[PDB]
Design a protein around this ligand. Structure first.
Ligand SMILES: O=P(O)(O)O[C@H]1[C@H](OP(=O)(O)O)[C@H](OP(=O)(O)O)[C@H](OP(=O)(O)O)[C@@H](OP(=O)(O)O)[C@H]1OP(=O)(O)O
Ligand SMILES: Nc1ncnc2c1ncn2[C@@H]1O[C@H](COP(=O)(O)OP(=O)(O)NP(=O)(O)O)[C@@H](O)[C@H]1O
Length: 1285
């Protein structure tokens, strides 16, 4: 319909071009006016004949908005155009829409204000958000506050506090301190938002309107225009209603009435049916008489004592009204059933009522599919589930498990992105059944456990968002206004309830009381029957809380330590917990280990022994032991004295004792030192002391091995860290603690080692004997049941005998299960290596022509001819006279003629038959690290394409069993060994975002491809599909502009830049012959400014908008793009990625994510070039506009801060991996690697640019953004970078 309207020059059956606009404008204005006053009763939009017409009204309202959205897109494409998103319309249409652009834009900006209200009414925040952003962008020259209000409300409905915060900062640069409060409410903090709203209202009116609430001192620690006043007043009521605080609602109503009567506002009025609120309060309080009496005033069919027309007339198409109607119907059914209990008397009519209610409640879920939303409504889903549960209990009389709401504790780890309202609705309908159980004499289903589970989960979610009052009420209900009250009232779900109470006490501010309660609870849990997950959780929580207050708790730990070798409540409790009866001695930790630090180790050991099935207990103990072991070993670089004195039957004894442990080939050095100092039983004491010093490493190794064995449950990020630590300790110290490493490696599984395989292969040249054997055995074992990860590396390596015997053994071991596969793999590798002739001859001739102006040339030519002796036959039959020509020219135009002929014949498409072809192959694809069900190669592409201007790349495709094509890129003489390390690093970084990705719609991810080297110079790189280069959009825009200007090729970036820098330099005195270094800064800034003003800054934004189908999809794609850009910007700045031109940045229109390809200018290599680069990442005009109206002030900055926080927390693993990359014999860095590692470490530690000052995450993000967005740095950049676009 939209296409027909645009293609007809707006001349539809509705009338002329103006009649259509007038009709749409009138309908939109009427609907918008009805939003302000819900009593307008718009004809054909608020009335229906039955319950089915009402759903149709909402459907029609959504369709109208979709039609307008498509019409605008088509008009824009008609007068401006796109780049592959939409097809160019005919010339006649383009000519008409180009001369009428002003009228079309004026009409749109004229109705944009009403469209936002209509979108807000229809429950489609995406429409109003997009329209608001478009309206704000045009406002570059009191309608500004209304737009901000609608935009903030829409963003609040979408649960996007980051965008709200960005908008607050953006608006602060134009009396808008109330936006932050809405941001707080968008995160689920209803208790704090109401207080902030009251504080703002008391200042915008001058009259105090506060109400009684929880202690404001601890509330903050746990987490003038009439329109603004009314908006804030209504939001406060909404916040109070969300947590179901009826008393607070009544108090707020009284306060609002008093404030209105004390200021004669005449415009401030709460828009909320209080009769419905009173009915809800009465129903929840158990007073069914008052509830049924109050329900008679609400609209709709009378309470049960036709079925199709249950909803009343004049109903607004607002989903909020539908939710209220459904709630009223549910309450009526519940009251009717309760009165009927005290089976077809009053059970026959209620079933039909509930069935109709359920049929109506599925409307919103159905509408959620018409628009690609990727998610279902939350309140609407629970309404339908509650109706189903009520229907089941009315017919089964609470006798089947289907009568309960399917809300369990499992939602704790899968629904962290939702507020507490769903739990409130579930609890409201569950308590009714619990109370109803008292009127059923027959057997029923146990609801007490379900109620306890729901209450505990609701309390946990309430505490996680600062709602102390709600959490207190829920905990009290489960247990059947000041912190002191909570302390005096709280100090299969027993242990969970106790731990939750302790956590709430800690959140309220009483850390000492919470610690004491946890200690008392742990002492009892350690003497329980099961206590599996209860002891570990309590001990780990107590240990974590102790580290927080390390300054105020260090004194107590010392006292408890001294008390053990011979006290407050917490100290005595800790003493009793560690002194419990069933491996760490004080002698091995009395050298450089702090006294309070030993208590933590004992606590970790106790947690690990009381719960051997918990992986967390082992990981914590292993980490603590490893850190202290490294510290004691670094710092160290009675029985012993008695043994030495007895075995040596005054200064000599002291010297010998000092030399025995001075700095412990070691045996020879010790013997020489002893002989030179004293002048053989010293070997026993020396061995005993060296073994005692390495006790921490042994304990850490045992704990790490146990943790890895328990993961054959825990995040892979921790697994990679443990494996890296074990490998590093085994490489560094191998002979001192070999007894543990040997057995552990011989018994450890092979699943947690699939992430450090390259490091294992790299450490195969260790200067030891059993170390190499152990690594080889581990790799051989990994090959079994998983040969797709050892096949290519072993085959390439086998194609210093230490680095050869291991590879041969691995290949032999892997060939014992499929010799045919190994042979085919070797044949394929050989064919690929030989498919890298004409190219060699051309290169040799070109090099000789330049190196000529003797015997070296003759020798090189002879070697090349000897090396060259389907495709080779043709080359030989066509140029076999080369040898004769070279021999005749030895005693020289033949070489020049051959080179010229080759160059002329060079100026792509090849065939596989002439350059063999297998089928039904069972070889793994080149790179299947993450593939549970590996796909084998099925065929090979019959054609090969050669990429021009980029050396000699070959695009080869591979067929799979899944009938899908997998493109690849073959490179010759590139040495892609370093790229593989970068790709592995990217995967390790992505590994740290697994936890945060479970409760965030826009996932934190860094797109990357696979790199498979095929030797020392060649390699196979994966091809990225679905992502287009950013330069394409600029090129298409240039072509469109040229075509438009032709009526009434395109220049290259260098040609366009010089054409402007020439006259500018000539107008000041200098000339083009002057060196680029000696160029005025003002001239460069002026040319950059002139170039930016000529290019449109919304190319990418418009392309992304035109690619999406619905507003919801547009919002999802925009958020995905912002988060991906932030993640890649921080990753690139941390590693030091450079050369970020338009051809190296790709964009996936399907999802909105970005992906980089070239990585040869990493590790700050772009800073030292002919034209140095001073920007950390690309933040040009087009990149910033695609982020929205606020730019880098909202989601981008916050996402960047989050990414930096995660990296700073997990920098240990990144540095460990980088160290391994540095010490790699297969990586060609050319102490450059040491400098690179130090630079990365400094950036990760926050000490990027500072002598001794350590910056913060926010400061670092701000500094990087400022350095990447300033015009002074973008002007003095290479012209090929295209800083103006
Ligand atoms: O109360 P719980 O249900 O046990 O929640 C805890 C804990 O919550 P609190 O910090 O509010 O006490 C943390 O939840 P998030 O921070 O991830 O939202 C997190 O612990 P940390 O972040 O402090 O490490 C995680 O525990 P963990 O990360 O160790 O798995 C989690 O669940 P569990 O404690 O049950 O594991
Ligand atoms: N993984 C990839 N996926 C898709 N396209 C790619 C990939 N890698 C490179 N390309 C593109 O395919 C071509 C490969 O040629 P390439 O050799 O990378 O260009 P180049 O000028 O030599 N830059 P460089 O790679 O640093 O030498 C270029 O046009 C790249 O933009």
């Amino acid at each position: 319909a939209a296409q027909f309207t645009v293609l007809s020059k707006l001349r539809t059956p509705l009338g002329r071009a103006q009649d259509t606009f007038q009709t749409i404008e009138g309908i939109i204005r009427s609907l918008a006016a009805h939003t302000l006053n819900p009593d307008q009763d718009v004809s054909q939009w608020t009335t229906a004949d039955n319950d089915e017409g009402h759903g149709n009204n909402q459907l029609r309202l959504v369709l109208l908005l979709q039609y307008l959205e498509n019409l605008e897109k088509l008009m824009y494409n008609a007068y401006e155009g796109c780049a592959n998103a939409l097809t160019s319309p005919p010339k006649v249409i383009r000519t008409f829409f180009y001369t009428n652009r002003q009228t079309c834009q004026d009409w749109l900006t004229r109705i944009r204000l009403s469209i936002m209200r209509v979108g807000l009414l229809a429950g489609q925040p995406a429409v109003t958000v997009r329209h608001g952003f478009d309206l704000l962008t045009e406002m570059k020259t009191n309608e500004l506050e209304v737009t901000i209000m609608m935009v903030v409300e829409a963003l609040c409905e979408l649960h996007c506090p980051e965008a709200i915060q960005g908008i607050a900062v953006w608006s602060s640069s134009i009396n808008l301190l109330w936006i932050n409060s809405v941001a707080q409410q968008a995160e689920g903090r209803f208790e704090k938002a109401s207080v902030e709203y009251q504080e703002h209202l008391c200042a915008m009116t001058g009259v105090d309107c506060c109400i009684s609430s929880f202690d404001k001192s601890v509330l903050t620690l746990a987490n003038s225009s009439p329109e603004v006043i009314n908006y804030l007043g209504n939001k406060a009521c909404e916040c109070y209603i969300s947590i179901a605080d009826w008393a607070a609602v009544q108090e707020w109503q009284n306060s609002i009435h008093d404030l209105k009567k004390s200021t004669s506002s005449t415009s401030l009025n709460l828009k909320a049916d209080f009769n419905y609120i009173k009915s809800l309060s009465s129903f929840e309080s158990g007073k069914f008489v008052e509830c049924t009496e109050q329900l008679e005033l609400l609209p709709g069919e009378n309470i049960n004592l036709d079925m199709k027309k249950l909803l009343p007339n004049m109903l607004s198409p607002d989903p909020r009204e539908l939710q209220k109607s459904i709630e009223v119907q549910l309450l009526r059914s519940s009251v009717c059933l309760a009165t009927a209990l005290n089976w077809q008397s009053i059970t026959e009519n209620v079933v039909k009522y509930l069935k109709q209610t359920s049929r109506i409640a599925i409307g919103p879920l159905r509408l959620s599919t018409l628009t690609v939303s990727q998610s279902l409504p939350v309140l609407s889903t629970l309404q339908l589930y509650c109706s189903s549960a009520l229907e089941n209990t009315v017919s089964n009389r609470l006798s089947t498990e289907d009568c309960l709401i399917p809300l369990f504790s499992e939602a704790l780890r899968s629904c962290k992105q939702h507020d507490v309202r769903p739990w409130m609705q579930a609890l409201r309908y569950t308590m009714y059944q619990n109370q109803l159980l008292e009127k059923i004499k027959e057997q029923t289903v146990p609801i007490r456990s379900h109620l306890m589970e729901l209450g505990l989960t609701a309390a946990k979610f309430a505490r996680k968002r600062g709602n102390v009052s709600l959490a207190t009420r829920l905990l009290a209900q489960c247990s059947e206004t000041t912190a002191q009250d909570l302390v005096q009232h709280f100090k299969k779900w027993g242990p969970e309830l106790d731990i939750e109470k302790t956590k709430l006490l800690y959140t309220a501010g009483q850390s000492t009381h919470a610690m004491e309660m946890l200690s008392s609870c742990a002492i009892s849990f350690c003497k329980s029957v099961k206590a599996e997950y209860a002891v570990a959780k309590s001990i780990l929580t107590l240990a974590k809380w102790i580290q927080a207050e390390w300054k105020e708790i260090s004194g107590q730990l010392k006292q408890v330590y001294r008390a053990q070798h011979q006290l407050s409540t917490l100290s005595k409790n800790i003493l009793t917990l560690i002194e419990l009866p069933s491996i760490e001695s004080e002698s091995t930790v009395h050298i450089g280990v702090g006294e309070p630090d030993f208590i933590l180790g004992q606590l970790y050991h106790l947690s690990s022994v009381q719960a051997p099935e918990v992986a967390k207990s082992w990981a914590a103990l292993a980490s603590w032991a490893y850190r202290w072991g490294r510290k004691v070993v670094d710092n160290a670089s009675x029985x012993x004295x008695x043994x030495x004195x007895x075995x040596x039957x005054x200064x000599x004894x002291x010297x010998x004792x000092x030399x025995x442990x001075x700095x412990x080939x070691x045996x020879x050095x010790x013997x020489x030192x002893x002989x030179x100092x004293x002048x053989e039983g010293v070997i026993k004491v020396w061995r005993k002391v060296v073994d005692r010093i390495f006790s921490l490493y042994k304990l850490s190794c045992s704990a790490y091995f146990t943790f890895l064995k328990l993961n054959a449950q825990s995040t892979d990020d921790m697994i990679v860290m443990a494996t890296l630590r074990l490998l590093r300790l085994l490489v560094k110290h191998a002979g001192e603690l070999r007894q543990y490493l040997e057995h552990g490696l011989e018994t450890t599984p092979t699943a947690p080692w699939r992430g450090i395989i390259p490091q294992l292969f790299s450490r195969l040249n260790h200067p030891e004997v059993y170390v190499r054997q152990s690594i080889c055995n581990l790799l051989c074992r990994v090959a079994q049941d998983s040969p797709h990860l050892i096949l290519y590396p072993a085959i390439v390596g086998t194609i210093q005998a230490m680095m050869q015997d291991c590879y041969s053994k691995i290949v032999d071991k892997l060939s014992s299960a499929n010799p045919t596969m190994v042979l085919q793999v070797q044949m394929l590798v050989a064919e690929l290596r030989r498919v890298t002739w004409d190219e060699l001859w051309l290169g040799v001739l070109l090099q000789q022509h330049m190196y000529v102006l003797x015997x070296x040339x003759x020798x090189x030519x002879x070697x090349x001819x000897x090396x060259x002796x389907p495709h080779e036959k043709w080359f030989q039959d066509n140029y076999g006279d080369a040898i004769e020509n070279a021999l005749e020219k030895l005693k020289x135009x033949x070489x020049x003629x051959x080179x010229x002929x080759x160059x002329x014949x060079x100026x792509y498409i090849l065939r596989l038959e002439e350059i063999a072809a297998m089928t039904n192959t069972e070889i793994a694809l080149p790179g299947e690290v993450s593939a549970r069900d590996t796909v084998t190669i099925h065929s090979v592409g019959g054609t090969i394409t050669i990429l021009p201007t980029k050396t000699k790349p070959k695009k080869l495709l591979f067929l799979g069993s899944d009938g899908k094509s997998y493109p690849y890129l073959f490179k010759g003489l590139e040495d892609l060994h370093l790229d593989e390390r970068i790709m592995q690093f990217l995967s390790i970084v992505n590994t740290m975002f697994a936890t945060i990705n479970r409760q965030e719609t826009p996932r934190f991810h860094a797109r990357h491809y696979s790199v498979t080297p095929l030797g020392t110079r060649s390699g196979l790189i994966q091809w990225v599909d679905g992502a287009t280069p950013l330069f394409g959009l600029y090129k298409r825009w240039q072509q469109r502009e040229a075509a438009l200007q032709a009526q009434k090729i395109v220049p290259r970036p260098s040609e366009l830049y010089y054409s402007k820098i020439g006259p500018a330099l000539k107008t000041v005195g200098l000339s083009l012959d002057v060196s680029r270094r000696d160029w005025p800064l003002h001239v460069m800034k002026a040319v950059l400014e002139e170039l930016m003003e000529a290019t449109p800054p919304n190319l990418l934004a418009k392309e992304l908008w035109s690619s999406c189908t619905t507003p919801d999809e547009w919002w999802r794609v925009t958020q995905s793009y912002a988060r991906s850009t932030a993640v890649m910007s921080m990753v690139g700045y941390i590693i030091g990625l450079g050369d970020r031109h338009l051809d190296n940045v790709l964009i996936d229109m399907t999802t909105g994510e970005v992906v980089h390809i070239d990585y040869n200018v990493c590790f700050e290599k772009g800073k030292s070039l002919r034209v140095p680069e001073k920007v950390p990442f690309r933040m040009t005009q087009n990149i910033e506009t695609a982020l929205g109206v606020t730019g880098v002030e909202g989601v981008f900055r916050l996402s960047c801060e989050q990414v930096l926080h995660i990296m700073r927390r997990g920098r240990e693993t990144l540095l460990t991996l980088l160290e391994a990359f540095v010490y790699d014999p297969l990586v060609d860095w050319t102490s450059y690697a040491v400098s690179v590692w130090k630079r990365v470490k400094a950036k990760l530690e926050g000490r990027d640019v500072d002598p001794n000052r350590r910056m913060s995450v926010a400061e670092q993000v701000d500094y990087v953004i400022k350095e990447a967005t300033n015009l002074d740095n973008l002007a003095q950049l290479y012209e090929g970078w295209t800083a103006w676009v």
